[PDB]
């Protein structure tokens, strides 16, 4: 156990960049739906 | 003040999708730098 810990922090950053991207999309759907609904009345 | 509150929640979702996207990139830089550094030794 010398440089094995790096693989740990690496796996976390992976699920963080992928999980972060998905989270942004969600917020993009709410802002896109609320912005498109505001155009109509 | 009937349908003005919508513009508020809308502005927030905007800075949330843009701020969220930027946050993902950051995590992508740390995972890309840690993954590229692991390939070398």
From Swiss-Prot, chains A, B:
Record-listed N6-succinyllysine modification sites: 35
Region of interest called Antiparallel alpha-helical coiled coil region, as start-end residue ranges on this chain: 6-38
Subcellular location: Mitochondrion
Consequence recorded when altering residue 6 to K: Retains its inhibitory activity at pH 8.2 and does not form a homotetramer at high pH
Marked site positions, Participates in pH sensing: 6
UniProt feature coiled coil, ranges: 1-41
Record's function text: Endogenous F(1)F(o)-ATPase inhibitor limiting ATP depletion when the mitochondrial membrane potential falls below a threshold and the F(1)F(o)-ATP synthase starts hydrolyzing ATP to pump protons out of the mitochondrial matrix. Required to avoid the consumption of cellular ATP when the F(1)F(o)-ATP synthase enzyme acts as an ATP hydrolase. Indirectly acts as a regulator of heme synthesis in erythroid tissues: regulates heme synthesis by modulating the mitochondrial pH and redox potential, allowing FECH to efficiently catalyze the incorporation of iron into protoporphyrin IX to produce heme.
Family affiliation: Belongs to the ATPase inhibitor family.
Domain-related comment: Forms an alpha-helical dimer with monomers associated via an antiparallel alpha-helical coiled coil composed of residues 74-106, leaving each N-terminal inhibitory region (residues 26-62) accessible for interaction with an F1 catalytic domain. The inhibitory N-terminal region (residues 26-62) binds the alpha(ADP-bound)-beta(ADP-bound) (ATP5F1A-ATP5F1B) interface of F1-ATPase, and also contact the central gamma subunit (ATP5F1C).
Subunit structure as annotated in this protein's UniProt entry: Homodimer; represents the active form and is present at a pH value below 6.5. Homotetramer; represents the inactive form and is present at a pH value above 7.0.
Protein name: ATPase inhibitor, mitochondrial
Phylogenetic lineage: Eukaryota, Metazoa, Chordata, Craniata, Vertebrata
Included range, full protein: 69 to 109 of 109
């Amino acid at each position: 156990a010398l440089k094995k810990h790096h693989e740990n922090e690496i796996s976390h950053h992976a699920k963080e960049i992928e999980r972060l991207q998905k989270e942004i999309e969600r917020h993009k759907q709410s802002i896109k739906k609320l912005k498109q609904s505001e155009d109509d009345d």
